[PDB]
Amino acid sequence: VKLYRNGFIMKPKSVSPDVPVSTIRNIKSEKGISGILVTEGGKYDGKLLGIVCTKDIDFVKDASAPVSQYMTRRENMTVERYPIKLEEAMDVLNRSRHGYLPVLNDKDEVVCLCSRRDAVRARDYPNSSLDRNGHLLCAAATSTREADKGRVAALSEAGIDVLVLDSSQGNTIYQVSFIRWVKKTYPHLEVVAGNVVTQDQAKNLIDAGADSLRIGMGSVLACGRPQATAIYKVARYAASRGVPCVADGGLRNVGDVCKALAVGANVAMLGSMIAGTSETPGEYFFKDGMRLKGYAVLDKGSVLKLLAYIHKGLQQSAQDIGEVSFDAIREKVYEGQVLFNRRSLTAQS
Amino acid sequence: NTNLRTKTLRDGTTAEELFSQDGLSFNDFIILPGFIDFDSSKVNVSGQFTKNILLHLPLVSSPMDTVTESSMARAMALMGGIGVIHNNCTVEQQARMVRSVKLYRNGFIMKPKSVSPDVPVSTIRNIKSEKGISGILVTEGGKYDGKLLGIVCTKDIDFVKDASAPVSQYMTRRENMTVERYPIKLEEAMDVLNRSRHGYLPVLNDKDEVVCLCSRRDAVRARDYPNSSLDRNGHLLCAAATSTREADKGRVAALSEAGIDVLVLDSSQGNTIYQVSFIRWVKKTYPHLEVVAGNVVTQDQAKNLIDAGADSLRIGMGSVLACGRPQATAIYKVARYAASRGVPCVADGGLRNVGDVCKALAVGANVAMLGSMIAGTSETPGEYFFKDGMRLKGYAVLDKGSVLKLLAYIHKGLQQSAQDIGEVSFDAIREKVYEGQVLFNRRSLTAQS
Amino acid sequence: AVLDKGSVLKLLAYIHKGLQQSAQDIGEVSFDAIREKVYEGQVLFNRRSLTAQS
Amino acid sequence: NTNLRTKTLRDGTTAEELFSQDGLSFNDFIILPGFIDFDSSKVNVSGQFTKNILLHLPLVSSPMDTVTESSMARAMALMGGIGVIHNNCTVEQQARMVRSVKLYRNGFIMKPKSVSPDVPVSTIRNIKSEKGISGILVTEGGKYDGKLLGIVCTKDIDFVKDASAPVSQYMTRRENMTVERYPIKLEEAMDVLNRSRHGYLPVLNDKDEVVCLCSRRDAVRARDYPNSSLDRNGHLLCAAATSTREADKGRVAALSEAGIDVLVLDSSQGNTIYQVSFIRWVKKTYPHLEVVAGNVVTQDQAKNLIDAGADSLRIGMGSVLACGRPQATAIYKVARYAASRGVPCVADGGLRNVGDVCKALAVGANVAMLGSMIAGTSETPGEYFFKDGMRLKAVLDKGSVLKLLAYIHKGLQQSAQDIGEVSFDAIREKVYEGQVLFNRRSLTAQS
Numbered sequence A: 001v002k003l004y005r006n007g008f009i010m011k012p013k014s015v016s017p018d019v020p021v022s023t024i025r026n027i028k029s030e031k032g033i034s035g036i037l038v039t040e041g042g043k044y045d046g047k048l049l050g051i052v053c054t055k056d057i058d059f060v061k062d063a064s065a066p067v068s069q070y071m072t073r074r075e076n077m078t079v080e081r082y083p084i085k086l087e088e089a090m091d092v093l094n095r096s097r098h099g100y101l102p103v104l105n106d107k108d109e110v111v112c113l114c115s116r117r118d119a120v121r122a123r124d125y126p127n128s129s130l131d132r133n134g135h136l137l138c139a140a141a142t143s144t145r146e147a148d149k150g151r152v153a154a155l156s157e158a159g160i161d162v163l164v165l166d167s168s169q170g171n172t173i174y175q176v177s178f179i180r181w182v183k184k185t186y187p188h189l190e191v192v193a194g195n196v197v198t199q200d201q202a203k204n205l206i207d208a209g210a211d212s213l214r215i216g217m218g219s220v221l222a223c224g225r226p227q228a229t230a231i232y233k234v235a236r237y238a239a240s241r242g243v244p245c246v247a248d249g250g251l252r253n254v255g256d257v258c259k260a261l262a263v264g265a266n267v268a269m270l271g272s273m274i275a276g277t278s279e280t281p282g283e284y285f286f287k288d289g290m291r292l293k294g295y296a297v298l299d300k301g302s303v304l305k306l307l308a309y310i311h312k313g314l315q316q317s318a319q320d321i322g323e324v325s326f327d328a329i330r331e332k333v334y335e336g337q338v339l340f341n342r343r344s345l346t347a348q349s
Numbered sequence B: 001n002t003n004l005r006t007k008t009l010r011d012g013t014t015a016e017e018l019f020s021q022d023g024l025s026f027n028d029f030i031i032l033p034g035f036i037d038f039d040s041s042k043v044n045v046s047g048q049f050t051k052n053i054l055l056h057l058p059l060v061s062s063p064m065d066t067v068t069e070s071s072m073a074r075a076m077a078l079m080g081g082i083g084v085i086h087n088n089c090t091v092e093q094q095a096r097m098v099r100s101v102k103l104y105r106n107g108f109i110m111k112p113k114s115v116s117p118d119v120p121v122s123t124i125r126n127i128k129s130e131k132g133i134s135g136i137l138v139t140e141g142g143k144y145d146g147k148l149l150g151i152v153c154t155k156d157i158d159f160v161k162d163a164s165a166p167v168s169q170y171m172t173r174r175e176n177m178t179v180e181r182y183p184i185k186l187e188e189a190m191d192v193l194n195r196s197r198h199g200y201l202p203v204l205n206d207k208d209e210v211v212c213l214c215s216r217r218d219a220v221r222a223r224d225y226p227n228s229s230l231d232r233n234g235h236l237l238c239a240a241a242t243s244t245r246e247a248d249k250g251r252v253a254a255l256s257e258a259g260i261d262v263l264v265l266d267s268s269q270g271n272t273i274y275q276v277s278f279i280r281w282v283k284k285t286y287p288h289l290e291v292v293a294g295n296v297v298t299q300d301q302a303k304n305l306i307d308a309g310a311d312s313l314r315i316g317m318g319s320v321l322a323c324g325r326p327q328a329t330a331i332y333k334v335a336r337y338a339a340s341r342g343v344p345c346v347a348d349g350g351l352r353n354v355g356d357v358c359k360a361l362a363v364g365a366n367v368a369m370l371g372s373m374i375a376g377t378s379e380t381p382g383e384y385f386f387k388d389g390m391r392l393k394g395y396a397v398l399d400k401g402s403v404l405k406l407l408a409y410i411h412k413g414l415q416q417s418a419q420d421i422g423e424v425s426f427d428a429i430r431e432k433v434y435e436g437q438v439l440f441n442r443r444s445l446t447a448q449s
Numbered sequence C: 001a002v003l004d005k006g007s008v009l010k011l012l013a014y015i016h017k018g019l020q021q022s023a024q025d026i027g028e029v030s031f032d033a034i035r036e037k038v039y040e041g042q043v044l045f046n047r048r049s050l051t052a053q054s
Numbered sequence D: 001n002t003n004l005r006t007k008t009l010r011d012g013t014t015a016e017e018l019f020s021q022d023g024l025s026f027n028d029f030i031i032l033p034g035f036i037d038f039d040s041s042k043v044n045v046s047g048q049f050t051k052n053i054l055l056h057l058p059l060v061s062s063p064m065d066t067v068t069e070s071s072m073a074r075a076m077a078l079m080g081g082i083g084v085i086h087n088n089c090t091v092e093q094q095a096r097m098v099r100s101v102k103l104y105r106n107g108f109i110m111k112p113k114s115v116s117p118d119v120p121v122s123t124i125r126n127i128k129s130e131k132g133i134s135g136i137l138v139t140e141g142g143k144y145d146g147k148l149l150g151i152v153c154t155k156d157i158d159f160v161k162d163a164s165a166p167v168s169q170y171m172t173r174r175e176n177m178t179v180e181r182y183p184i185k186l187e188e189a190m191d192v193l194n195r196s197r198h199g200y201l202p203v204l205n206d207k208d209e210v211v212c213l214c215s216r217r218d219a220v221r222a223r224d225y226p227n228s229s230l231d232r233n234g235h236l237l238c239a240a241a242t243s244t245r246e247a248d249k250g251r252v253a254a255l256s257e258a259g260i261d262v263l264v265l266d267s268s269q270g271n272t273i274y275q276v277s278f279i280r281w282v283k284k285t286y287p288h289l290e291v292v293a294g295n296v297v298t299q300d301q302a303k304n305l306i307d308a309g310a311d312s313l314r315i316g317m318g319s320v321l322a323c324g325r326p327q328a329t330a331i332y333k334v335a336r337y338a339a340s341r342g343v344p345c346v347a348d349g350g351l352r353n354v355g356d357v358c359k360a361l362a363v364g365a366n367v368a369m370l371g372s373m374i375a376g377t378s379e380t381p382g383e384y385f386f387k388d389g390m391r392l393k394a395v396l397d398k399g400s401v402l403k404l405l406a407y408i409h410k411g412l413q414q415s416a417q418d419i420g421e422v423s424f425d426a427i428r429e430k431v432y433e434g435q436v437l438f439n440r441r442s443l444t445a446q447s
């Protein structure tokens, strides 16, 4: 997730000259990156020798041939010398009509790499959630046991921006200790504690140092809480203390997501609603004349189209409510200017 | 962690407010979570069956002829609960079932089953097949207190082809038997039994007459069932049902002779003059007996039956007659009133899953009565049959397998629920519910989907 | 059309016995008594939630 | 292993006996297994769509306005089948769809899309988004044969914010272009294009005017779809439907100009004087066209339509409602009669799963027409929308038709394997010979 989008591509995937074309095809097929640099000994910081792109090997019949036979050789490559501002480098890339632009030191060793694909990703996805280095934001879940400490470190090395604690009932001493320890050891990390449904639980986990709370429990065990009430109560208390909340569960259509956001949740967690989209894990199969996903659910197509659909739905709902933002809706709900009506059981038909 | 466990915001609804409006069933509300600082294994689910009887496992088998006979009561007692032998039978049958339950587990086995030397092996096989006891003593004239002559065990007759042969032909003879002389402490006797690698150890007087008997099977039962509900003599606890008519007096006596520890009154509406008189008479005549009065659903009824001297109350009525009460409201109200007067209550009815049992115990019931939930387990009365490719029980219900596995499942479920609630015992849950520290939420009809 | 319920006399006796058993469970020996005690607040009720009717 | 494969006991029922009584559907019978000595990968499912057109994949997209337009026909032809563009449109729209299918894949592109230098970038973006072609040539006056001035590709305009700018500002200009001079063999031209690492190679005369254009995308399409149904010039095969009225004559002409290779007559009951006259007129006026007559269900209708000069027959009627025939019987009877006269048949209707398609092909059909089975795939006409959390187009989204066609392919292969023959031509022959046998299933025997 983190290295898909970059400005300057650090540690660019590179190979040695004797590598077979089969390896470059494998790189493109599994990991999906082109423009492989060919360097001294394949080290990502070695002397730049060449580059291998899509059109350089799409015609070759002997997949065992070395890339040096078909790579574009360094003397013929447009390159840049460190230092360079990303803005100038990407304008150079644009003017060059090429897909990639390496940046080298005085010894022709590979310092970094600019990809036109990143420019086009930025153009086609102008609202991407990004960190300060131009990478996509990524969160990761973990339990709060003692072993999971290791996990956290690893994820911190991988570059997660948010840690999310996984628990059906998050108001535990183990989770409080874990939040304290995470904020102490990895101050750069933000933690989403939970799960909770009462303002007690929220108090404990916010006192521990939680930066956000996951609301939901039950959306045979006799313990839980109706989800809309839980969201309103916990989100109100947390907002009084400056902490946003995530609605997690019972979110099955767009009206429910809009309602959950209006009554206090800042963001909404989607599980069932997006399960079976093309981007989820699992293999597709045909059965009974229906496309399904298995380790079953119905194919909903691209998650991108679904996200845009939900976006437009939330916008139209906010419009009908008469406010131009959902922060405004939350503020005016707490203020008593956005109003509701409880529906009798009959009125829901 | 009292700072972390103690709710000050108190975001939720207390039981008193929850049950202040219309009558509720268990699906109408849910329990809110608390604070966890312990593993679910450490949770104590015990509850009082009566003023004086605490059950490690707060579960009681219902006194229906389709649920509780000797076998079910034994299983319940072994898992830490108790069973109520149904009263749809003669006094003699009920007393025999009670005896089956009470003499299954012993320390010293009094009146050990014994036979005379001329008895055929067929008789010993019958004893093992019907009543399930081995290690039959062979004595003078078959009297259980006669001179000890020998012992007959499983391996002594499992190879014999002439079932008419006398046991004296194959019994282990007394001169070769490890025995003990009265007096002896049970501890020393059972250690001797262990060291001897044998299954049985008789205890005799100076005349070699049988005083009593120790069984290794009792040691292994104690090891495999460490939480068994026991009386002070090492026997399994047993309860028995009876109506409150005048004839049933006889029944009571018989059951008292059989050794019941709890008498349970059987009535759809227990707030009657006949039941009040019966409770008075039972407490007067058999002070050692504890009585579970009922059934009731209002605090009026509870007052009358507790004034009569009830040691516990069965709650439930309706879980075409127009009279009854939603079960959760009934449980909360009656259990609160009875607890104010020091009497525990049994939830009887409408208990169909583990969440309902947990809720019923949290809102005031000390123990829960199971009928439908355990009907069709291997230990209930009735014969198994195959039909439509399904195993069913008949005098129909689906086979649920062993009641022991089901009881352990319910135990683990109650423990996990108590953990999620944030209390390490159900007595604690009840106290904190009355205190307003365990909170609830009423669920709209829509919120139950 | 309707299903045969047999004699109305047997049905009336059935309803009679049912009313008697209900009054007994309620704890009053007459329905005039039940009405009086209902107005007096000594015969009590419980409203049933929609769930409690199952 | 002919000794092991050859049935002598012949425990089973032959097709002739099976279809000798009442009219059957596909669920009324099952095919008995034979002898296996091969992998399903080696099974040839190909079938004749017409007397002269063999399809690597015996699948035809139905000419319904909800199933087959240019995109569906392209997918079918690419996977080794073919599509029939529906006739629920004007003649010009149908001809445009046919042209799209025919000019999607080329060797030499003879009429390469061209623009004049003053055209805005927005127009090239529109071309790429609507028609899906890049490497637009910029020539004198925008004529596809004018003097070559430059070329516009993806990376030449992906960064510009002023969409009204002329292409002359950003195009790759002629002086810097790798080009070739007419004449040149396609083999050498495309190898040169490969070595050049570019996406396009114009071919010009001595006057620098555009003769034609080679596209790397065509090479890669040939590599990724080696079994595409193609004509002799490297274009995808395309069929188009038409009614048999007198006005439709015009329609036919237009389609002939657009380059269809097969005409398909649209009628619930094709044994009419109008259809006979239409077939005669088509074979006389446009001999290069092959005609699939229909629809028919009896051998009398087939006799008339074959005498008229039909190259293939569409089977199906009923798969108010008083006229028709159970589809499996119709297929067996008509396909047997037509095969006796050297005409293949298309199964049209009641084909709802892979077992049904396999049965229909085994009992005589050379190819099978797909309608419902492929409705709702990404390549069908219509817009997708969300409802009740399901995505629909109404029918449910089935994803890519290509993956579904591959699924059907593997299914037919595995079925043929279990039957014990390495091709469906062999299966049909052995069915007529009595060496592939069947069993009718009682109504209870169906579960």
Ligand SMILES: Nc1ncnc2c1ncn2[C@@H]1O[C@H](COP(=O)(O)OP(=O)(O)OP(=O)(O)O)[C@@H](O)[C@H]1O
Binding pocket: A034, A035, A051, A052, A053, A054, A055, A056, A071, A072, A076, A077, A078, A079, A098, A099, A100, A101, A102, D197, D198
């Ligand atoms: N900085 C560069 N200098 C010189 N040649 C380059 C440079 N970057 C890429 N190339 C070459 O451009 C030629 C065409 O690029 P190619 O199409 O193969 O991959 P791409 O630029 O990533 O775009 P796409 O994969 O979508 O076609 C290749 O031969 C490639 O080696």
Ligand SMILES: Nc1ncnc2c1ncn2[C@@H]1O[C@H](COP(=O)(O)OP(=O)(O)OP(=O)(O)O)[C@@H](O)[C@H]1O
Binding pocket: B134, B135, B151, B152, B153, B154, B155, B156, B171, B172, B176, B177, B178, B179, B198, B199, B200, B201, B202
């Ligand atoms: N106190 C004893 N002294 C001598 N022999 C004994 C004594 N108790 C039992 N035995 C004998 O031990 C032998 C083996 O015991 P046996 O297996 O038949 O029954 P068990 O001890 O109850 O165990 P199990 O029935 O499970 O096999 C028998 O011959 C039995 O008579």
Ligand SMILES: Nc1ncnc2c1ncn2[C@@H]1O[C@H](COP(=O)(O)OP(=O)(O)OP(=O)(O)O)[C@@H](O)[C@H]1O
Binding pocket: A055, A097, A098, D134, D135, D151, D152, D153, D154, D155, D156, D171, D172, D176, D177, D178, D179, D198, D199, D200, D201, D202
């Ligand atoms: N014959 C040519 N001579 C010189 N430059 C060319 C020639 N053809 C294309 N180019 C240029 O090289 C690049 C063409 O890349 P390419 O043809 O692979 O683009 P495409 O077909 O639109 O798809 P993609 O680039 O994404 O693979 C552009 O910069 C283009 O101006």
Ligand SMILES: Nc1nc2c(ncn2[C@@H]2O[C@H](COP(=O)(O)OP(=O)(O)O)[C@@H](O)[C@H]2O)c(=O)[nH]1
Binding pocket: A003, A004, A009, A010, A011, A012, A013, A014, A033, A034, A035, A036, A037, A115, A117
């Ligand atoms: N050549 C090239 N490398 C890229 C591109 N995008 C990202 N990378 C880098 O390629 C690397 C992916 O391979 P790598 O992580 O080293 O292998 P792994 O250790 O098995 O996961 C990462 O270092 C990315 O940063 C690209 O577009 N072209």
Ligand SMILES: Nc1nc2c(ncn2[C@@H]2O[C@H](COP(=O)(O)OP(=O)(O)O)[C@@H](O)[C@H]2O)c(=O)[nH]1
Binding pocket: B096, B099, B103, B104, B109, B110, B111, B112, B113, B114, B133, B134, B135, B136, B137, B215, B217
């Ligand atoms: N020999 C033997 N007797 C046992 C054992 N366990 C219990 N008993 C006694 O065996 C007797 C069972 O038979 P009994 O009650 O006398 O016959 P009943 O009057 O028809 O019920 C009881 O007295 C039990 O106490 C055992 O393990 N071995």
Ligand SMILES: Nc1nc2c(ncn2[C@@H]2O[C@H](COP(=O)(O)OP(=O)(O)O)[C@@H](O)[C@H]2O)c(=O)[nH]1
Binding pocket: D096, D099, D103, D104, D109, D110, D111, D112, D113, D114, D133, D134, D135, D136, D137, D213, D215, D217
């Ligand atoms: N520049 C270019 N032209 C192509 C390519 N593939 C097909 N064409 C041609 O582009 C033309 C597109 O149709 P056109 O007649 O220009 O538009 P229409 O009048 O609306 O049908 C066709 O003549 C195709 O032959 C390609 O890859 N690059």
